[PDB]
Each structure stands twice: as C-alpha cells, then as structure tokens.
Design a protein around this ligand. Structure first.
Ligand code: HEM
Length: 137
C-alpha cells in the first residue's frame, strides 16, 4: 500500500527521485522553464549535474515526509502551507503539481513493482486540493 511504497522509494531515493523527476520533465517539457539550467540536456547529462541530483533528491526527501505525515493520502495543512509559501515555489500554480503526480503515477504503473498507484493518484489530487486551500493559484 501507500505506506510501504514510501518505504520502497526511500530505500533507493536518489534513483527513484531522479527517474520520476525526469519522467515529469520529459512528459511536460515546458516545466523545464522553471529551472532554466535543465534546458538542452539529456537525462544522463542532467544526472551528472550536481544541482540536479542534489535538488531533486531534496524535493523527494520532503515529498516522502509529506506523504508519511498524511492520513488516508490527505496531507497535513501545515505541509501544504509550507509548499505554498516556500520562496522557491513563488511562480508555481497547482497545475505544476497536478502534472508531476500524473507523471509519477504513470511511472509507477509502468514499473515492474507493486506500487499502490491508485493511492498515489489520490495523494496527488488531495495535495493539489490542499495547495489550493492554502492559497496557491
Ligand atoms: C510534492 C511536491 C514537491 C515538493 C515536496 C518540493 C520540494 C522542493 C524542495 C525541498 C526544494 C528545495 C531544493 C533545493 O534547494 O535543494 C524545491 C525547490 C524548487 N522546486 Fe519544488 N517541490 C515539489 C514540487 C514542485 C513542482 C511540481 C515544481 C515545478 C513544476 C517545483 C519547482 C521548484 C523550483 C523551481 C525550485 C527551486 C529551483 C531549483 O530547485 O532548481 N517544485 N522544491
């Protein structure tokens, strides 16, 4: 289920984080505009860029904490407010997060592993609802 999936992802988090983030950026190429330095680079090149690996892992470090603190795939209001108020998320709208979790769920469905893809789909929707409620446009 959802909780075990958190453990599975945390057991190889840098690799899962990079693979899911790349699935997101490759499914939605315009999303690279939010990072600038990722433009014009293949996956293997991005994986050799220090900030890509370090920032992407930290993204998923926090994502797993928010998932772990959720109840029935519904994140805490305080976690949603943190994601809205982060200076690094100044530009973002809920659409950016919706697309990320579409790609994450698609990644899990295509995976050979028994991820609870439906729970991650609910989590993505519930997180988008919470971000909107906490003031993200
Ligand atoms: C649950 C989902 C997300 C979580 C937990 C999360 C978390 C984080 C964290 C921890 C950082 C700091 C990284 C660092 O400074 O090393 C960060 C930075 C950033 N995030 Fe998010 N993020 C999420 C979703 C998104 C999405 C969907 C986008 C855009 C499509 C986004 C755009 C950015 C940008 C532009 C930065 C700063 C620039 C950069 O790190 O290169 N984030 N995020």
């Amino acid at each position: 289920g959802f909780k075990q999936d958190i453990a599975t992802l945390r057991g190889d988090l840098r690799t899962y984080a990079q693979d899911i983030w790349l699935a997101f950026l490759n499914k939605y190429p315009d999303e690279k505009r939010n990072f600038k330095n990722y433009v014009g680079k293949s996956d293997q090149e991005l994986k050799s860029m220090a900030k890509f690996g370090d920032h992407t892992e930290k993204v998923f470090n926090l994502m797993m904490e928010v998932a772990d603190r959720a109840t029935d795939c519904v994140p805490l209001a305080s976690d949603a407010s943190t994601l809205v108020q982060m200076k690094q998320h100044s530009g973002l709208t809920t659409g950016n997060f919706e697309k990320l979790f579409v790609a994450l769920v698609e990644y899990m469905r295509a995976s050979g592993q028994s991820f609870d893809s439906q729970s991650w789909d609910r989590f993505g929707k519930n997180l988008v609802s919470a971000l909107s409620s906490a003031g993200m446009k």
